[PDB]
Amino acid sequence: SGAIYVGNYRVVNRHLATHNDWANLVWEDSSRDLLVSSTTAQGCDTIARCDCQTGVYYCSSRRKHYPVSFSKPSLIFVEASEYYPARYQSHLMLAVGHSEPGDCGGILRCQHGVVGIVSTGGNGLVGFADVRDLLWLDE
Ligand SMILES: Cc1ccccc1CC(=O)N1C[C@H]2C[C@@](C(N)=O)(C1)C2
Ligand SMILES: [Zn+2]
Numbered sequence: 636s637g638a639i640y641v642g643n644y645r646v647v648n649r650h651l652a653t654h655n656d657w658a659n660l661v662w663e664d665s666s667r668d669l670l671v672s673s674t675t676a677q678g679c680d681t682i683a684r685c686d687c688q689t690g691v692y693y694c695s696s697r698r699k700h701y702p703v704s705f706s707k708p709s710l711i712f713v714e715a716s717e718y719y720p721a722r723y724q725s726h727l728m729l730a731v732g733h734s735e736p737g738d739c740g741g742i743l744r745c746q747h748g749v750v751g752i753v754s755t756g757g758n759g760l761v762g763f764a765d766v767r768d769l770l771w772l773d774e
Contacts (some may be wrong), residue, residue, distance in 0.1 A: 636695070639749055640678030640715065640736040642770050644756025646671050648754055648764070650718035652765045666725045668754045668764050671772070682772055683747035691762040692761065696735040703730035705743070713755055726765045727755065734761035 639646035643688070647656060649663050649670040654748040663670040691700050708726040715721045728743075734756025741753040743763045755762030765773070 636737070636754060637693070637742060639680050639682075639752065639766065640674065640676075640744065641680050641682055641749070642678050643672050643674055643680060644762075644772055646752070646766060646769075646772070648752060650716075653741060664725075665719065666722070667727075668724060669766070671769075680742075681748040682769075683745050683750050683767055684770070685745060685747045685767065687745035687747065687750065690750050692730075692732070692743040692763070693741040694738060694753075694761075696738050696743055697733060701732050702711065703732050703743075705730040705762070708768070711755075713763070718745075723756055724755065724762075724764075726768065728763045728765055730761050730763070731757075731759060732761040733759070734739050744753050 652670040659672040661671045686694045702725045705728040710723045711727045713724045738753050749765040754764040
């Protein structure tokens with residue numbers, strides 16, 4: 636679990652979105668596993684606008700933050716689940732690191748701010764849904 640609060644927006648993993656998220660929907664994309672809903676309160680976070688390939692993410696299954704090198708946002712195959720059929724997930728970045736179901740929503744940050752959120756994992760890898768291209772979150 637976990638979310639990004641920026642201005643009047645909440646960014647969450649689409650497969651974890653609540654009834655309230657869907658009732659206040661701004662945008663969603665199943666191919667990215669992202670959903671953005673509106674909020675009444677002003678957010679707590681800032682978004683990075685960069686091409687960093689290093690950062691630190693929060694791993695709830697270990698109650699720890701870990702530094703990672705991660706790949707560029709790309710199209711990567713993801714196996715079927717109670718949430719999605721087998722498909723290519725876009726804007727996904729992989730890193731060598733620990734992750735388990737329940738870790739989705741953990742924030743990845745670089746020196747410039749929020750980069751993305753944990754969205755995939757397994758076999759010593761962790762995948763992050765990128766949010767740096769969503770320039771409209773700022774305005
Ligand atoms: C995070 C993790 C780590 C180790 C094992 C399993 C997992 C869970 C995982 O990969 N997904 C669960 C939901 C979100 C997901 C997607 N993006 O399509 C992928 C369906
Ligand atoms: Zn950066």
